[PDB]
Design an enzyme around this catalytic site. Structure first.
Site, PDB file in Angstrom:
ATOM      1  N   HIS A   1     -61.508 -66.689   8.522  1.00 46.95           N
ATOM      2  CA  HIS A   1     -62.717 -66.107   7.763  1.00 46.95           C
ATOM      3  C   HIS A   1     -63.412 -67.546   7.144  1.00 46.95           C
ATOM      4  CE1 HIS A   1     -59.707 -66.346   4.125  1.00 46.95           C
ATOM      5  NE2 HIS A   1     -61.091 -66.558   3.454  1.00 46.95           N
TER       6      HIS A   1
ATOM      7  N   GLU B   1     -57.690 -86.232  -0.305  1.00 42.86           N
ATOM      8  CA  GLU B   1     -58.729 -85.640  -1.710  1.00 42.86           C
ATOM      9  C   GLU B   1     -57.680 -85.433  -2.803  1.00 42.86           C
ATOM     10  OE1 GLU B   1     -61.666 -85.412  -2.765  1.00 42.86           O
ATOM     11  OE2 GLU B   1     -63.133 -86.116  -1.058  1.00 42.86           O
TER      12      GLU B   1
ATOM     13  N   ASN C   1     -59.500 -85.480  -6.553  1.00 42.01           N
ATOM     14  CA  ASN C   1     -60.615 -85.080  -7.370  1.00 42.01           C
ATOM     15  C   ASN C   1     -61.797 -85.079  -6.314  1.00 42.01           C
ATOM     16  OD1 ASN C   1     -62.907 -84.910  -9.022  1.00 42.01           O
ATOM     17  ND2 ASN C   1     -61.952 -85.907 -10.738  1.00 42.01           N
TER      18      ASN C   1
ATOM     19  N   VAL D   1     -65.269 -86.592  -7.391  1.00 37.38           N
ATOM     20  CA  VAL D   1     -65.136 -88.105  -7.716  1.00 37.38           C
ATOM     21  C   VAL D   1     -64.677 -89.190  -6.575  1.00 37.38           C
ATOM     22  CG1 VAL D   1     -64.693 -90.152  -9.308  1.00 37.38           C
ATOM     23  CG2 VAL D   1     -64.915 -87.798 -10.253  1.00 37.38           C
TER      24      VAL D   1
ATOM     25  N   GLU E   1     -60.292 -91.273   0.225  1.00 36.20           N
ATOM     26  CA  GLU E   1     -60.712 -90.025   1.175  1.00 36.20           C
ATOM     27  C   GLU E   1     -61.373 -90.462   2.494  1.00 36.20           C
ATOM     28  OE1 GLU E   1     -62.105 -91.419  -1.389  1.00 36.20           O
ATOM     29  OE2 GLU E   1     -62.111 -89.946  -3.116  1.00 36.20           O
TER      30      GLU E   1
ATOM     31  N   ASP F   1     -55.903 -63.968  10.886  1.00 36.91           N
ATOM     32  CA  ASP F   1     -56.753 -64.921   9.894  1.00 36.91           C
ATOM     33  C   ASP F   1     -56.262 -66.286  10.073  1.00 36.91           C
ATOM     34  OD1 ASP F   1     -58.927 -65.661   8.364  1.00 36.91           O
ATOM     35  OD2 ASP F   1     -58.136 -64.988   6.680  1.00 36.91           O
TER      36      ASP F   1
ATOM     37  N   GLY G   1     -61.258 -69.891  -3.379  1.00 39.01           N
ATOM     38  CA  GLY G   1     -61.389 -71.564  -2.983  1.00 39.01           C
ATOM     39  C   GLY G   1     -60.346 -72.021  -2.478  1.00 39.01           C
TER      40      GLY G   1
ATOM     41  N   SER H   1     -58.552 -70.266  -0.135  1.00 39.16           N
ATOM     42  CA  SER H   1     -58.402 -69.816   1.316  1.00 39.16           C
ATOM     43  C   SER H   1     -58.270 -70.865   2.378  1.00 39.16           C
ATOM     44  CB  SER H   1     -59.598 -68.904   1.637  1.00 39.16           C
ATOM     45  OG  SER H   1     -59.672 -67.726   1.368  1.00 39.16           O
ATOM     46  N   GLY H   2     -57.339 -70.434   3.297  1.00 38.17           N
ATOM     47  CA  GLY H   2     -57.123 -71.556   4.289  1.00 38.17           C
ATOM     48  C   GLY H   2     -56.148 -72.743   4.239  1.00 38.17           C
TER      49      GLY H   2
HETATM   50 CA   LIG Z   1     -62.015 -87.659  -4.271  1.00 38.62          CA
END
Ligand SMILES: [Ca+2]
Ligand SMILES: [Ca+2]
Lengths: 223, 110, 223
Positions: free
Chosen positions: A40, A52, A54, A57, A62, A84, A175, A177-178
């Site tokens: 979904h 990741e 933050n 920032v 990253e 799903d 937020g 999800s997945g």
């Molecule tokens: Ca970051």
């Protein structure tokens, strides 16, 4: 994540953020070129952000890699959320290091009571909105299929499991999800749905990954 | 939204959330259909992007529910709380409302 | 009905289904033109279905007769369910036969300990939900007034009787209301309400038919 805690920076190296302008879902790195997430969460264009901590920032560790292929499970049902699960092939391989690593697929399904780790950048409040910049972590057990269906009569398929606390206060949320549900080094669940967040006798419902190991491997081999 | 209120809003945990109301309906929303399993259980198949909204019933949940045995029945939750749900019309604390619809879900499983 | 068994096709010829589009309550044929049920089952429009066994499948022996009159007891109390009885006069006389038969009214009240047959198409789960397509049957004894009052302190009037088991497990449930409770061929109870379904120390509460024979007979004669 509601009622959880701020994970130590990069202590969840397989956790990735799905971004199409902003963070909208989580995902799990299971291969240097493959990420597994919730069907979904599909979008025709997705950018995977690895390493990741933050999300607001630039910190240096990253890796921004775009989705080269997005494959939603062929049997996924948008209304029931059965099946799903979705796989994302990265345009280029992800550089593996201490802060960006893969997580193992389940060697067997988790038994009720198994303590797991759930993580994500989702809502931290069961009432209102409070989106964190730092990845949140939560210790939660896999619940029996019995109390799960008890909590969601006629809504739990064989590809879903409830993980969390029946008394509420701790659960995943919008937020997340997945994102991953890892137990003893194995990815047993994918954040999917639920009635609200952290509600009494209303645990989170997750895709039962142990039932998708075959689909995951055959898709990866065929792509 | 495709519904004024929904007691059972199945919502994904993405941003934004994608919800569907599983409340059983009879007269029927844009597309009405059968719920998984019993084709006799009609529901609105419309999905909505965003917060689902208020819960139709007068309580978030109820452990001590007394109901008539018709289907759907009419129920009154005698649970004593420190604060009623924003959907309870009369909060005297306890909510005296007599809601017509599905039996309320239990706060504590058993 | 929870914890019962599927009755034999047309073995309960006085049992009817009250349908307003869908099945919502049961009833009992006491006259070729009259059905007795519960006051809280009232609706301005009601169709009576007799000769039914499987409500989801036309079988050839059923009769669909719409209600021509729906008379609730004048003293019915919507907040306590006291005087929970109602009479329906069919728009056309039902054809009596082996599948469609009447049940006699009580000659006197049933004594505690008397075994009775409770039937209907209501839920069969005490926790989840499972509505049967075939008419369910249950054997249960009339409980003492003292036992009824103790389990339901301050809510039992003289027009109510408890029927079932204190241990829970077997009992009527949502969808059975208005349905019959026959003992030695006499209607003694009408499914009305209760605390949950088949719960411990919460036996079913039924309208006490042996208090209303005069109301019934006079109502029929005057309408
Ligand atoms: Ca970051
Ligand atoms: Ca039939």
């Amino acid at each position: 994540i509601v009622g959880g805690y701020t994970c130590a920076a990069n202590s969840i190296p397989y956790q990735v953020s799905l971004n199409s302008g902003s963070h909208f879902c989580g995902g799990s790195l299971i291969n240097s070129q493959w990420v597994v997430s919730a069907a979904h969460c599909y979008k025709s264009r997705i950018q995977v952000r690895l390493g990741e901590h933050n999300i607001d920032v630039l910190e240096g560790n990253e890796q921004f890699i775009n989705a080269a292929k997005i494959i939603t499970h062929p049997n996924f049902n948008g209304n029931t959320l059965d099946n799903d699960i979705m796989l994302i092939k990265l345009s280029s391989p992800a550089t593996l290091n201490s802060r960006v690593a893969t997580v193992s697929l389940p060697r067997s399904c988790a038994a009720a009571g198994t303590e797991c780790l759930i993580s994500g950048w989702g809502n931290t409040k069961s009432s209102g909105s409070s989106y964190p910049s730092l990845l949140q972590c939560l210790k939660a057990p896999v619940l029996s299929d019995s109390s799960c269906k008890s909590s969601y009569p006629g809504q739990i398929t064989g590809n879903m499991i409830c993980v969390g606390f029946l008394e509420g206060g701790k659960d995943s949320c919008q937020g997340d999800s997945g994102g991953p549900v890892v137990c003893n080094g194995q990815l047993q669940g994918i954040v999917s749905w639920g009635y609200g967040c952290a509600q009494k006798n209303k645990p989170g419902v997750y895709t039962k990954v142990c039932n998708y190991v075959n689909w995951i491997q055959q898709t990866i081999a065929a792509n | 939204r495709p519904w004024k209120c929904c007691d059972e809003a199945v919502c994904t945990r993405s941003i934004p959330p994608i919800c569907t109301c599983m409340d059983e309906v009879f007269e029927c929303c844009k597309s009405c259909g059968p719920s998984m399993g019993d084709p006799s259980r009609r529901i609105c198949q419309d999905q909505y992007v965003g917060d689902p909204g208020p819960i139709c019933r007068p309580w978030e949940c109820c452990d001590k529910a007394i109901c008539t045995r018709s289907n759907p029945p009419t129920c009154r939750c005698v649970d004593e709380v420190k604060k009623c749900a924003p959907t309870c019309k009369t909060c005297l604390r306890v909510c005296i409302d007599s809601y017509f619809g599905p039996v309320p879900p239990r706060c504590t499983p058993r």
